[PDB]
Amino acid sequence: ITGRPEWIWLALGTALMGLGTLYFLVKGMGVSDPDAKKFYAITTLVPAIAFTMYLSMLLGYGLTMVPFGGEQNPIYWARYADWLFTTPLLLLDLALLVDADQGTILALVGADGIMIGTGLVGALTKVYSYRFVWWAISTAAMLYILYVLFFGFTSKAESMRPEVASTFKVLRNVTVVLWSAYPVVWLIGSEGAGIVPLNIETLLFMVLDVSAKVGFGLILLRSRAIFGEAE
Amino acid sequence: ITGRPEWIWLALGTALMGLGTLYFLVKGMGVSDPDAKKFYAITTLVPAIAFTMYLSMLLGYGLTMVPFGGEQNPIYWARYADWLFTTPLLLLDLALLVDADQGTILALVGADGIMIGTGLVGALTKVYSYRFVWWAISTAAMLYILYVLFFGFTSKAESMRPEVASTFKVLRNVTVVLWSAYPVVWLIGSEGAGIVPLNIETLLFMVLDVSAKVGFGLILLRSRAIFGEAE
Amino acid sequence: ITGRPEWIWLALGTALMGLGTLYFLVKGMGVSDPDAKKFYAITTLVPAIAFTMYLSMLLGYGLTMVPFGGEQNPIYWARYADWLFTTPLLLLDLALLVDADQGTILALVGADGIMIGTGLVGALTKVYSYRFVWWAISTAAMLYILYVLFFGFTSKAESMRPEVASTFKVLRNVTVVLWSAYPVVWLIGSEGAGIVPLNIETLLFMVLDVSAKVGFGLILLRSRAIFGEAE
Ligand SMILES: CC(C)CCC[C@@H](C)CCC[C@@H](C)CCC[C@@H](C)CCOC[C@@H](CO)OCC[C@H](C)CCC[C@H](C)CCC[C@H](C)CCCC(C)C
Ligand SMILES: CC(C)CCC[C@@H](C)CCC[C@@H](C)CCC[C@@H](C)CCOC[C@@H](CO)OCC[C@H](C)CCC[C@H](C)CCC[C@H](C)CCCC(C)C
Ligand SMILES: CC(C)CCC[C@@H](C)CCC[C@@H](C)CCC[C@@H](C)CCOC[C@@H](CO)OCC[C@H](C)CCC[C@H](C)CCC[C@H](C)CCCC(C)C
Ligand SMILES: *C/C=C(C)/C=C/C=C(C)/C=C/C1=C(C)CCCC1(C)C
Ligand SMILES: *C/C=C(C)/C=C/C=C(C)/C=C/C1=C(C)CCCC1(C)C
Ligand SMILES: *C/C=C(C)/C=C/C=C(C)/C=C/C1=C(C)CCCC1(C)C
Ligand SMILES: CCCCCCCCCCCCCCC
Ligand SMILES: CCCCCCCCCCCCCCC
Ligand SMILES: CCCCCCCCCCCCCCC
Ligand SMILES: CCCCCCCCCCCCCC
Ligand SMILES: CCCCCCCCCCCCCC
Ligand SMILES: CCCCCCCCCCCCCC
Ligand SMILES: CCCCCCCCCCCCC
Ligand SMILES: CCCCCCCCCCCCC
Numbered sequence A, B, C: 001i002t003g004r005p006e007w008i009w010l011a012l013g014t015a016l017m018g019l020g021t022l023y024f025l026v027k028g029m030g031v032s033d034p035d036a037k038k039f040y041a042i043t044t045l046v047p048a049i050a051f052t053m054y055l056s057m058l059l060g061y062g063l064t065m066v067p068f069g070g071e072q073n074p075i076y077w078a079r080y081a082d083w084l085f086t087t088p089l090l091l092l093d094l095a096l097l098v099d100a101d102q103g104t105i106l107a108l109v110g111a112d113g114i115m116i117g118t119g120l121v122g123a124l125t126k127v128y129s130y131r132f133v134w135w136a137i138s139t140a141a142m143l144y145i146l147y148v149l150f151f152g153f154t155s156k157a158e159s160m161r162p163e164v165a166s167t168f169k170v171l172r173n174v175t176v177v178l179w180s181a182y183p184v185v186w187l188i189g190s191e192g193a194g195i196v197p198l199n200i201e202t203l204l205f206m207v208l209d210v211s212a213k214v215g216f217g218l219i220l221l222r223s224r225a226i227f228g229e230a231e
């Protein structure tokens, strides 16, 4: 395990996701409100899935070698397995907060699936120049998602409770900033142009992942917006 | 890319799915009705997914070699990845049109999953005679789906709005004819008996795919059946 | 096929799932009640999926070799493909019976996904001692599911119809006993410590699978709890 310099960040990531999972699990024990239960379920599952995939990367299972540029390049494929399930759960948290219509939710989840799926294909593609074609398609799917979060959701939040409108606005802003960093790190890291070494890349993704999951969850689950308006 | 004679049909397929995706995306921009949004979301996602998988076939990612009959046989596995997601979306379009009950929808999607999954296993099976066992099981799942579309849905459409009944009937008929061709092409093509060469097989699937997705979508999204009855 | 001593149990399993599938399919033909249709759909799909995966194991497709302990160890990976889809369907049968809230259903299905997914990783892991780390995480996800079935569902059933409360209690008890055997068989069988040989392991899983699917389904589909209260 320690044979890879990036192991320290995989281990820290595993620990922080594990701790985040346990914290949300305990916190949600005292919850009976049916609406709050939905948000706790979604939000606890996110770091639990990430915990398993960080562990698989730490132990070496979630790593494969991909030939491109005349080299055997270490590619952590387990990231995409994580993201396939956790990024639509994160979007679902946002969509339920603002009572999004079903068509909009399906558009978001579908675009998200395309985003992660094409990122996976790009990560595993052996023809170097083609990796960036997949990156571009994935990034276009991301831009669609960000567009919807701003010009379909923000003006939906404003007709809702003030506490859900303010909580949505904060989580929207956190999401757009954090999620936009992922394609940049991929592009300059070992999957793309290879300018930033894998150990630093792994650190960067770990900070983004913990912030986008445990950070996000801490903000959401401390808000009164997750509860039905009750006396 | 041009090293494979079937590349021209993969390229045309990619282009037509891409163009179809953009057309539906633009067309649905001016839509606020919650019901119509569902149909636009579902129907736009279908060629978008197909676009990505056609591209993966064009670039060579979605192709593998399978030993059977003492030969290395080129198998485009990306078709099944496409179909796994797009065929239940197509069925969902039909089921929502007639306000199908939840049990019926689950039966359809489940049978569809079995249909595509067993087709994939058959496509990748190395014992030649066993490929046709999987083809038979998949075809039985197809026949179940077609049965339900006729003797569970058609008489559901007739108690609904005339515009939804007439639109459903047309899309049902398009679906049954087009979908029934797929097992025949598989059986006589490079996956099955090998009587029709891969380049012609690829052409045939491209015509079926564009018709079943973009053709289907053009009929559906031009109907007033996708809108709630409103003043 | 007969080259593997466990083939007889794979063949019997295939037959019993096939027969169970046909029986439930015929039985549900005379059903119009929308609630009952849901239970028939879910419950018929379960042995149908299991039939396909038992067949893939019989024909040899669903088997791979995994190096650990200095040996090539036969691992039937198709079990996890089965279980990935059938165990959440089984939980859905239980959850719908007691009209579980959406948050609880998502927690169950999510924990179940983690349970099966980590079992799959453990089954395919090449470092022997690490296989048991994945077994432990999977078992913890199982224990969560069993906890919810007892201390979240049982007291939900009691405020419902007596026929649904009594049917739920029986199916809950069947589920907890049968499902708890699976991690034990894995641990002592060819995936784990290797004390029980593969042919006996295969027998054990076949008895558990038929009981947990066809047995379970026979109890559920003969109950009046699956019908809406109607005059
Ligand atoms: C509604 C939304 C969910 C829409 C989803 C959007 C989605 C369509 C976007 C594209 C997804 C698609 C790229 C998934 C591809 C998975 C694939 C990378 C798995 C690895 O297999 C690739 C090659 C080795 O590189 O296998 C070597 C050759 C092997 C023989 C491969 C044969 C097995 C195939 C992988 C079977 C395909 C199954 C499905 C792709 C399962 C989807 C997995 C998940 C990653 C989407
Ligand atoms: C409700 C509905 C959805 C019901 C669904 C119906 C469904 C049950 C029908 C059968 C689906 C099942 C056949 C999927 C099999 C996928 C498999 C072909 C992927 C390729 O792996 C096959 C061999 C190489 O040929 O791998 C070589 C050996 C490797 C070590 C394989 C180990 C990895 C396994 C593939 C893990 C299994 C994961 C699940 C099958 C994911 C499902 C993928 C999708 C195609 C259904
Ligand atoms: C809401 C709930 C559903 C939550 C779900 C919980 C879930 C997160 C729990 C963990 C699931 C995760 C372990 C699935 C891993 C599948 C993996 C074993 C498939 C086989 O690939 C493993 C190695 C060979 O051993 O591939 C060799 C290297 C290859 C290059 C691998 C590259 C292809 C990757 C497999 C692509 C990943 C796609 C997704 C994992 C699809 C999920 C399949 C299913 C088994 C969950
Ligand atoms: C918890 C993990 C999260 C929130 C991950 C988010 C990841 C993305 C938004 C990834 C986006 C990518 C692209 C837009 C193109 C390049 C490849 C990706 C997959 C890194
Ligand atoms: C957009 C793509 C569509 C509508 C594809 C439909 C495909 C089928 C109905 C495929 C059916 C098959 C069988 C019935 C058995 C042989 C294998 C298949 C998968 C080709
Ligand atoms: C129809 C099949 C059923 C009901 C299978 C149930 C399987 C399980 C509950 C498996 C549990 C496992 C663990 C808890 C850890 C070890 C690995 C598994 C996957 C066997
Ligand atoms: C969105 C953030 C992307 C920028 C990442 C900056 C990383 C700077 C680290 C120094 C680069 C290491 C190069 C020498 C090894
Ligand atoms: C459902 C349509 C299946 C029939 C396809 C007919 C294809 C005819 C093309 C000629 C066959 C090529 C054989 C000589 C290369
Ligand atoms: C939950 C049941 C697990 C116990 C399984 C008992 C199997 C006993 C069979 C005898 C073991 C075979 C060892 C000699 C080959
Ligand atoms: C490819 C995996 C996509 C599914 C991820 C799980 C999250 C799905 C959330 C469903 C949202 C509800 C839509 C109506
Ligand atoms: C194996 C992939 C199956 C899922 C495909 C996505 C479409 C699912 C549509 C869900 C229909 C709603 C059922 C209640
Ligand atoms: C990884 C596969 C998980 C999906 C299995 C299919 C069963 C899903 C049942 C959905 C229950 C409804 C939740 C709201
Ligand atoms: C186009 C929608 C406006 C809100 C999205 C902001 C786009 C940020 C760009 C992210 C950088 C990705 C490379
Ligand atoms: C049995 C249901 C009647 C409607 C379905 C028509 C079946 C068409 C056969 C398709 C050919 C597949 C090989």
Ligand SMILES: CCCCCCCCCCCCC
Residues within 6 Å of the ligand: C139, C143, C146, C147, C150, C180, C183, C184
């Ligand atoms: C902790 C919840 C109480 C009900 C679950 C009973 C646990 C049975 C243990 C199963 C054995 C697995 C190794």
Ligand SMILES: CCCCCCCCCCC
Residues within 6 Å of the ligand: A128, A129, A132, A133, A136
């Ligand atoms: C070796 C790099 C070749 C450049 C490929 C860039 C493709 C980016 C596509 C953006 C439309």
Ligand SMILES: CCCCCCCCCCC
Residues within 6 Å of the ligand: B128, B129, B132, B133, B136
């Ligand atoms: C080499 C071909 C052997 C014939 C197999 C046909 C099987 C079809 C099954 C239909 C019930």
Ligand SMILES: CCCCCCCCCCC
Residues within 6 Å of the ligand: C128, C129, C132, C133, C136
């Ligand atoms: C070779 C076996 C080494 C023992 C591993 C047991 C790990 C079990 C983890 C339970 C917390």
Ligand SMILES: CCCCCCCCCCC
Residues within 6 Å of the ligand: A025, A028, A029, C140, C141, C143, C144, C147
């Ligand atoms: C990680 C295993 C958890 C089993 C005990 C249940 C914890 C309490 C959860 C309350 C919903």
Ligand SMILES: CCCCCCCCCC
Residues within 6 Å of the ligand: A011, A014, A015, A018, A019
């Ligand atoms: C509760 C702490 C969980 C941390 C387990 C994984 C950390 C890796 C240590 C090497």
Ligand SMILES: CCCCCCCCCC
Residues within 6 Å of the ligand: B011, B014, B015, B018, B019
């Ligand atoms: C908008 C046109 C999209 C076409 C891109 C793929 C066509 C392949 C050209 C070689």
Ligand SMILES: CCCCCCCCCC
Residues within 6 Å of the ligand: C011, C014, C015, C018, C019
């Ligand atoms: C209807 C009987 C189904 C049995 C088919 C599979 C049994 C395997 C026989 C070798």
Ligand SMILES: CCCCCCCCC
Residues within 6 Å of the ligand: A174, A211, A214, A215, A216, A218, A219, A222
């Ligand atoms: C993006 C950083 C999130 C910070 C989380 C802090 C949570 C405290 C309530």
Ligand SMILES: CCCCCCCCC
Residues within 6 Å of the ligand: B174, B211, B214, B215, B216, B218, B219, B222
């Ligand atoms: C099956 C062929 C479909 C033809 C689509 C034409 C759409 C015009 C409205």
Ligand SMILES: CCCCCCCCC
Residues within 6 Å of the ligand: C174, C211, C214, C215, C216, C218, C219, C222
């Ligand atoms: C766990 C054993 C189940 C027994 C099923 C018998 C069904 C008869 C109604």
Ligand SMILES: CCCCCCCC
Residues within 6 Å of the ligand: A019, A022, A023, A026, A027
């Ligand atoms: C990591 C366990 C958290 C302890 C409880 C925190 C207050 C709910």
Ligand SMILES: CCCCCCCC
Residues within 6 Å of the ligand: A169, A170, A173, A174, A177
């Ligand atoms: C008003 C919300 C500001 C949140 C910005 C957080 C940036 C990481």
Ligand SMILES: CCCCCCCC
Residues within 6 Å of the ligand: A176, A177, A180, A181, A184
């Ligand atoms: C809305 C601001 C987006 C900031 C992008 C930051 C990418 C590192």
Ligand SMILES: CCCCCCCC
Residues within 6 Å of the ligand: B019, B022, B023, B026, B027
């Ligand atoms: C391909 C872009 C379509 C242009 C608009 C067509 C009329 C909505």
Ligand SMILES: CCCCCCCC
Residues within 6 Å of the ligand: B169, B170, B173, B174, B177
């Ligand atoms: C009355 C509907 C006829 C549609 C037939 C289309 C055949 C491709």
